[model samples]
Target: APALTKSQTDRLEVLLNPKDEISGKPFRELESELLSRRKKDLQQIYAEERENYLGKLEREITRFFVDRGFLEIKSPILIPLEYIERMGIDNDTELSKQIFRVDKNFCLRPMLAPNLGNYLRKLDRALPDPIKIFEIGPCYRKESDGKEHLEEFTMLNFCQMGSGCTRENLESIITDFLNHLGIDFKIVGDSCMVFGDTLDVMHGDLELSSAVVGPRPLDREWGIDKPWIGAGFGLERLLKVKHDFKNIKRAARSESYYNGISTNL
Candidate 1:
């Protein structure tokens, strides 16, 4: 017998008494009876190891920044709709339609860029120059769930401002950073936020990171005059590559997989 999840066990207990939703039959005899009469098909055993595998990867990433002068900070999950609009993504944009709404005024953050960039928009004086920081947290989007997409996901965003933040500097750091993680990655000219053009870091066919180096033309609207480099990566997607998972969402905090089995029963 396999371990049952909390809800699964509860459902089993209710069925043990009678009036089971499916057949109103007791679970005690359902298993053996189904085996004898239901003509069952075969399936494979699975394992869900959500522990130290990626948890260690997270700490490894944290440690990588400690010596490099990057400070880890946190931001809220909800923000005024106006902030997202500032990204050149208005309510008319497809991305804006995916934002999880809280009210007419706020919505669940679809990305970490708005909060991180908000820090830099205080005329870049909220902190001293060379302010290197990174944040890891949940970001929500109205996504159609699939093997690679999720409505709720985790993001890791890191950026450096003020001085020495250049494309050359960024690529070298990201290349070494991705390499340190033992992931085979390649950087190519691609599209990114803040700046329309960017260098995208890809693993096989899927993109793992997007980086931008800026004189950032958008900075003027936010009341800043600075060049910076930043990168955003999805933890689950990276885990999908690093750990060889068939689907990225399985590595996330989800109810879809329990103790490795992909189904409830």
Candidate 2:
């Protein structure tokens, strides 16, 4: 029997990783099945690429909240610097340094928390008790980061103010959200610069979302005095975990890939 060519082996190596079940097979037998499998996978990838997982995911999540009577809010992308400071981030903080400044008074919103804070406070007075609202939008940061990080990425932020703001309710919201998407996750205690202590929704070691319960010191700046529970999820990170994608850029707005496939090849 003729042996596999260098290019044939290289292509197989690229298509499948070493940890794959078939990697232990003899080259002669492996190539036969690998070639067949590669064609099938490429067909599915192309189909998914056209449908666009990110687009569908956003709609899916929007509906999930809507079904539960959560109002969807669209806030300004460019916000005043005072809003950033409201998150307890000052001019000299490391998080402040990563902000994309548009001019002196304003900058691209680094996170959805500040915008949500404004809504929580305003809607409380205007609407009935127990204000539930959410926003999904692109957030910007200027920094050199790893595969899991993005300079510009989509954020899904939802909050419930008034009743049901306890730690138990926070976990319930996190679990229900993950369960709605059929995602396997665990609630872990974690900390970030802005929210000192948080309940992180985790898949293995990768955090899918961060949850916080407030009557916090930070709330006073936004004129928010009621107890609340909120969480923010990176949409691209969710897609990466769902699709078993090697690089997160494939799931984001990028020049390198179109719907999780490299544009180069």
Candidate 3:
């Protein structure tokens, strides 16, 4: 990945520190001369690049799923509090804590799986063996502020239903997807784990599972009385990895753009 050049960093600094950059002028004058123009100019470039790169990746990944007999589906962005609670997403889960709550305590959906599961339940009959579905949609989370962490972001989720949809089958799909994306990852342990609970034992419980290592304080609160396997990835982190692979930086400096636009008439 291309490192941030000195000029780029300098521009970014100015972009980030607009008030300091355009001092001594009346606030209105400063806004008119540097803030507003800089905001538009930078946002235009960033939007264009983001769309170009993300759109290409989305199409490529979605097509891969479609080719594998997965049906693409869209889930509602809004969900009721009842369902969120049913999923055991309480204050302990970062997402449940920070979701945008509505008057009825409805929340912005934070994960596609619960919605997908709800969709399955609403169906008239059990889906045919190996129900394969995928969705790409916005999810919200309350914590973390960084270039890589947005309050709301997109998620790509795939689900399989049926006895035939074994852990190995899912692992194969995941491995193939990562391989296609040129990510380097390995299956760390026993691939035989099929149910969510078994997979959880292997890949979750950061404290108890040697295969998994992280400070997952919330795992204890999940209330998973039975075994099941579910997987999710942070979209921005994946994008960051790809960016590093491609040797690219932000298309525009965010601070300058925000300051320039917000200060203007």
Question: Which candidate leads in lDDT?
Answer: 2
lDDT by residue (1-265, candidate 3, tens digit) is 3455567445434434323433333433443555566666657867775454445666887898899887778879988877777666656655556778875867888767667665544441555655566777677767555444556666777765544445666677777877787765555443321112323211121211111111133332332122222455544445545544211123122332231232222
Backbone Cα, N, C clashes tallied per candidate = 1, 0, 8
Report the CA-based lDDT of candidate 1 relative to the real structure. 0.71
Off by over 4 Å in 3: 1-51, 92-94, 123-126, 188-230, 245-265
The TM-score ranking, best first, is: 2, 1, 3
Give each model a TM-score. 0.75, 0.83, 0.60
User: Considering only N, C-alpha and C atoms within 3 Å, which residue pairs clash in candidate 3?
Assistant: 1-247, 2-247, 15-256, 35-260, 196-228, 196-229, 197-227, 197-228
User: Which ten contiguous residues of candidate 3 have the minimum total lDDT?
Assistant: 205-214
For residues 138-207, write the lDDT of model 1, one tens digit per residue: 8888877577877888788888888998888898889878888888898988864336898888888888
lDDT rank order: 2, 1, 3
In model 2, which runs have C-alpha deviations exceeding 4 angstroms?
Answer: 1-49
How accurate locally is residue 219 in candidate 3, as Cα lDDT from 0 to 100?
Answer: 31
* lDDT of every model, 2 decimals: 0.71, 0.82, 0.52
Question: What C-alpha RMSD separates each model from the true structure?
Answer: 9.6, 4.2, 9.9
Regarding TM-score, does 2 or 3 come out ahead? 2
Better of 1 and 2 by TM-score: 2
Candidate 2 per-residue C-alpha lDDT over 1-265 given as tens digits, one digit per residue, 9 for 90 to 100:
4666788676555455323575345575676665566565557877665566788899999999999879999999999988887788977889978999898999999889888888888888789878999999999988686678899999999999998778997787778888888788898888888788988888898888988888778788889899999999999999888777766776898775555654433
